[PDB]
Design a protein around this ligand. Structure first.
Ligand SMILES: Nc1ccn([C@H]2O[C@H](COP(=O)(O)OP(=O)(O)O)[C@@H](O)[C@@H]2O)c(=O)n1
Ligand SMILES: Nc1ccn([C@H]2O[C@H](COP(=O)(O)OP(=O)(O)O)[C@@H](O)[C@@H]2O)c(=O)n1
Ligand SMILES: [Ca+2]
Lengths: 225, 227
């Protein structure tokens, strides 16, 4: 079986911002290029930014242009995955056993260690979520007016990426959902859980920051001196 | 009836940052300054560690000279609940508690609280049991009861990050903290968690993503850039 990388960069964007010296997207793709087991690295880019992602690849990673496929992502992260898996299928026809390690372009501090656990866990599980023990106190409210519930904070995890699973599996489970369900089931791991599937946990790092806000940008800058 | 600010501002065992310089003033000072903005808050009761009581007194004498008779320094407890107990009992020494007297509890290490947040807490406390300043979770929260594979990914749209202010009536909190045993108090160290699990109507207050909790070093670095 093959292993692929699925970089999600189709968002609406922070990943084309310079971090230190190079775009966050380039930082993120970098960690995947060394990994011997990863066949191609496939990036879902917003259809408008595709060409600008390739100029970026040429300018910043000319040694790996062959290892990278830049493809049009979709309206929401799940769709981007669909599109990434489709592009994988265009490179080599998917077998039941081929794998995708998906990851946010805006997470530029993922470690080869994480990547390797995800790949490694996926052997004897349906899918793999990368998480860390929750820091904030989490409060629930179905209405958004008063507290409907407070979950037990000793079993809560802050969810990050990689999210790793077989390709066919995603195309099957995601495929079988009405639009209304897709709109509610936005997390890729959620879909596996509700379909009653075994999703194991990969140890993430509190440092696996996801860069969404101008505050996240500062935290990142201080992490690279 | 009365309105008090209860500033949870002391303890060890966890190096907590409330006495560090932010811009020019210690963080705690920034925090107290927000509550002096509110004309309606009677006194501002600050709950510091035993060793730090006088250090805090001086900080008021040095940085808040005029609003010094507005502020009352007191000893904290082992946990913030024991501290709220101590803040409450300090107020009862100042002015005997009237069943409706509310306390606006707040982390001393959250100096970016606005008056808007404060006023929403006094207001929402009117016809609710308690108030919890809150913001929409930005992170997907994942539940796992076993610890190796997931048992639940709640809907994120319905999930919230806890902040402070947390507001309530003084007698109301004491009467619940009482019925709890010494081993019972351990399992639920947050104040709003007591109200909910003893079935009470505690409403949400729109918080702020800028309402940072200064705990780590990078947190201090973010904070310094914000002011
Ligand atoms: N259609 C989409 C939407 C978002 N994304 C984004 O997914 C990652 C970050 O997720 P997000 O915070 O935008 O959304 P979510 O919180 O993961 O649902 C980014 O690396 C990427 O920009 C994507 O690749 N394709
Ligand atoms: N007995 C205690 C213990 C800690 N605290 C802490 O509660 C406030 C915010 O919490 P923190 O940032 O120290 O973090 P933690 O809640 O102690 O994990 C601090 O101002 C103070 O150090 C308290 O008010 N009373
Ligand atoms: Ca009443």
């Amino acid at each position: 079986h093959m292993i692929y990388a699925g970089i999600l960069a189709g968002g609406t964007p922070k990943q084309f911002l310079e971090l230190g010296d190079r775009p966050i997207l380039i930082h993120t793709i970098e960690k995947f290029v060394l990994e011997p087991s990863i066949e191609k690295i496939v990036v879902g880019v917003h259809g408008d930014w595709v060409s600008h992602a390739e100029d970026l690849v040429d300018k910043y990673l000319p040694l790996y242009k062959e290892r990278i496929i830049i493809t049009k992502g979709g309206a929401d992260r799940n769709t981007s995955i669909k599109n990434i898996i489709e592009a994988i299928d265009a490179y080599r026809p998917l077998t039941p056993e081929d794998i995708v390690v998906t990851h946010d372009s805006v997470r530029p501090f993922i470690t080869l260690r994480m990547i390797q656990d995800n790949i490694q866990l996926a052997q004897n599980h349906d899918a793999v979520d990368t998480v860390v023990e929750a820091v904030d106190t989490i409060v629930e409210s179905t209405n958004g007016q008063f507290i409907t519930d407070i979950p037990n904070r000793a079993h809560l995890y802050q969810g990050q990426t990689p999210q790793t699973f077989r390709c066919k599996d995603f195309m099957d489970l995601y495929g079988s959902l009405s639009d209304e369900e897709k709109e509610i089931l936005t997390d890729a791991c959620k879909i596996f859980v509700i379909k009653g599937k075994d999703v194991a946990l990969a140890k993430g790092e509190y440092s696996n920051l996801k860069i969404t806000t101008v505050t996240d940008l500062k935290i990142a800058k201080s992490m690279i001196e």
